[PDB]
Amino acid sequence: FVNQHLCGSHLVEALYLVCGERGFFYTPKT
Amino acid sequence: FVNQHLCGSHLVEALYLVCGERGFFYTPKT
Amino acid sequence: FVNQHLCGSHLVEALYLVCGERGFFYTPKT
Amino acid sequence: FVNQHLCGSHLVEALYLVCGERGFFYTPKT
Amino acid sequence: FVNQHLCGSHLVEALYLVCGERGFFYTPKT
Amino acid sequence: FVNQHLCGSHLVEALYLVCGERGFFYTPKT
Amino acid sequence: GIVEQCCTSICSLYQLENYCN
Amino acid sequence: GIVEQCCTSICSLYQLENYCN
Amino acid sequence: GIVEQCCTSICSLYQLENYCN
Amino acid sequence: GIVEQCCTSICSLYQLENYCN
Amino acid sequence: GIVEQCCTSICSLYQLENYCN
Amino acid sequence: GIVEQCCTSICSLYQLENYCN
């Protein structure tokens, strides 16, 4: 089941994959 | 062999793992 | 929690790991 | 360094991520 | 949803990442 | 390119996948 | 904002662009 | 067929062979 | 064909579509 | 012991040290 | 700056803190 | 012993059993 501490580690993979060479800011703390 | 396009996807995992709840900015474009 | 869109990404890893050099068809759309 | 036996496990993740709900055939044996 | 058979595969990544060069024993069978 | 610090994180996945419910000792320090 | 939004059932390709730099 | 079958609690090694080429 | 083509330095988004179903 | 303890909601950095060699 | 620095042979735990928010 | 042996080009299924508990 894990939690965001491990789920976000994979959301970023698709994030910069969609951005390509661009970058992004990841903040797991709403 | 892949490239940064796939290597960075895993550098971020340890990045926010060290930051814990904090966040970080990932820009694969020096 | 994510969904099949991310769960299948890891089911394939063990799939071709069991097939070895063989290949397989992955269709996430029953 | 690993080899295709581990590199392909991650190429598929982006493959069906681009296909979305569609599927694809992965054969690591040219 | 998967199960420990796939969840533990990622718990080990952070395990030896915290141990650094040290090692650890992983037994998914309480 | 990364190094063993990241390569071993994925060797363990197939390790306990082959062991099934059994366990194993991973020591990245020959 | 983004984690709880995409970690629930994956976001759309465009939704991820909103967090692009 | 295969995703909902293995993404629930992992399939057996032989069950994965059925989807092998 | 696809592995040696994308496992070298990643393929483009369209190149992956050629292997889509 | 360790899986059911960290696979539920991640363990703390020190808790992982207990399983270090 | 950070990718070419850690994607070569992994960075140290403190080096990653420099990129923390 | 095991890392430098399998992290070079993957080990065989039986070779991994030697490190099983």
Neighbour tally for C15: CB within 10 Å: 25
Query: CA-CA distance, D25 to D5, in Å (whole number)?
Result: 16
Q: Residue L11: what are its φ and ψ, rounded to 5°?
A: -95, 175
Q: Which is nearest to G1 in space by CA: B26, B12, A28, B22?
A: A28
Q: What angle do CA C29, D4, D8 make, to 5 degrees?
A: 20
The amino acid occupying position B1 is F
Q: Is A22 on the interface with C (CB under 8 A)?
A: no
Signed CA dihedral, F14, F15, F19, F22: sign only: negative
Q: At what angle do helices F4-19 and C4-19 cross, to 10 degrees?
A: 80
Domain positions in chain C are 1-30
Q: Which chains touch K (3 or more CB pairs under 8 A)?
A: B, F
Token pair belonging to J6 = 């960290």
Query: CA-CA distance, J16 to E24, in Å (whole number)?
Result: 10
Contacts of K19 (CB under 8 A, 6+ apart): B15, B24, B25, B26, K2
Q: Is C10 on the interface with E (CB under 8 A)?
A: yes
Q: Residue E28: what are its φ and ψ, rounded to 5°?
A: -80, 60
- Chain G residue numbers touching C1 (CB-CB < 8 A): 7-9
Cα–Cα distances (Å) from L11 to D3, F10, F14, J4, in that order, read 10, 13, 10, 29
Measured between CA atoms, how close is A18 to chain B, in angstroms? 10
Long-range CB contacts (within 8 A, 24+) of G15-18: G16/A14, G16/A15, G16/A18, G16/A19, G17/A18, G17/A19
DSSP three-state, residue E12: helix
Residue ranges of the alpha helices (H) in L1-21? 3-6, 13-17
DSSP J5-17: HHTTT---HHHHH
Candidate from A9, A23, A25 with C-beta closest to B23: A25
Measured between CA atoms, how close is C26 to chain E, in angstroms? 17
